[PDB]
């Protein structure tokens, strides 16, 4: 049933979990007790922009990802329409959250317009760029800047174009 906390996410049974723990030795990330763990996730989604086209359909993405991450056991913070500076501030605050200490993992989701260099902030234009680089995201979440997430999986998901090209070439059969 999809009425449970995990919704439409297919459950891992007790026999399935033991099969995973038997096939691989000490090569799996440990998960904390369900009763006490405080898993955190952050979604930053930019839909409304100053100078570039509105991202219609972004609400569907926010809904889908929020519900999915909740299904997987994460408490989800949703932040919308931020500059690159605001995203940096938000990421810094996220890295400082006390819950990471009693968590086993985290998810970061970024959804916006994008260019080769990185992810567009709300104020982005060709004349005056407003870009958050993937490199900055990693730096803000690493062991130096986020010691609470040491040894813990940090999954970064980015929906954004990476340039203007169609990503295809032709060939003949």
């Amino acid at each position: 049933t999809s009425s449970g906390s995990e919704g439409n996410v297919k459950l891992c049974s007790l026999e399935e979990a033991q099969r995973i723990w038997k096939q691989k030795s000490a090569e799996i990330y440990p998960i904390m007790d369900k009763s006490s763990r405080t898993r955190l996730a952050l979604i930053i989604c930019n839909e409304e922009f100053d100078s570039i086209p509105r991202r219609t359909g972004a609400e569907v993405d926010i809904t889908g990802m929020t519900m999915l991450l909740q299904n997987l056991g994460y408490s989800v913070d949703v932040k919308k329409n931020l500059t690159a500076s605001d995203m940096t501030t938000e990421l810094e605050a996220f890295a400082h959250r006390p819950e990471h200490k009693t968590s086993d993992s985290t998810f970061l989701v970024f959804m916006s317009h994008g260019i080769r260099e990185g992810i567009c902030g709300k104020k982005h234009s060709e004349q005056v760029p407003d870009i958050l680089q993937l490199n900055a995201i990693f730096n803000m979440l690493n062991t130096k800047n986020c010691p609470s997430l040491k040894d813990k999986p940090k999954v970064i998901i980015i929906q954004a174009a990476r340039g203007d090209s169609p990503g295809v070439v032709w060939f003949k059969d």
Binding site: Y29, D61, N71, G73, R116, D151, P153, R162, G163, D164
Partner: protein
């Protein structure tokens, strides 16, 4: 006592396309990468680790249409398999 730790470890990034290339979004259906990711996470979180799920997502994009893209896994320092164990 103090001990050394790697400055950067246990990361995985998953981008919607390859460098230089567009990523597609539908006005009512949302972003295809996001929708495809959710579907695969819902189906495979129970049995596959995250690296494996992301590979499956990439495979689903293999045959290119009018709106083509190839999601890319980036800067991976996962030292173990990350299983979500949904339900646990």
């Amino acid at each position: 006592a103090i001990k050394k730790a790697h400055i950067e470890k246990d990361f995985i990034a998953f981008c919607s396309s390859t460098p230089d290339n567009v990523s597609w979004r539908h006005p009512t259906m949302g972003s295809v990468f996001i929708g495809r990711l959710i579907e695969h996470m819902q189906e495979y979180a129970c049995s596959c680790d995250v690296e494996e799920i992301f590979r499956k997502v990439r495979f689903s994009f293999e045959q290119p249409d009018g709106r083509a893209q190839m999601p890319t896994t980036e800067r991976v320092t996962l030292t173990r398999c990350f299983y979500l164990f949904p339900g646990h």
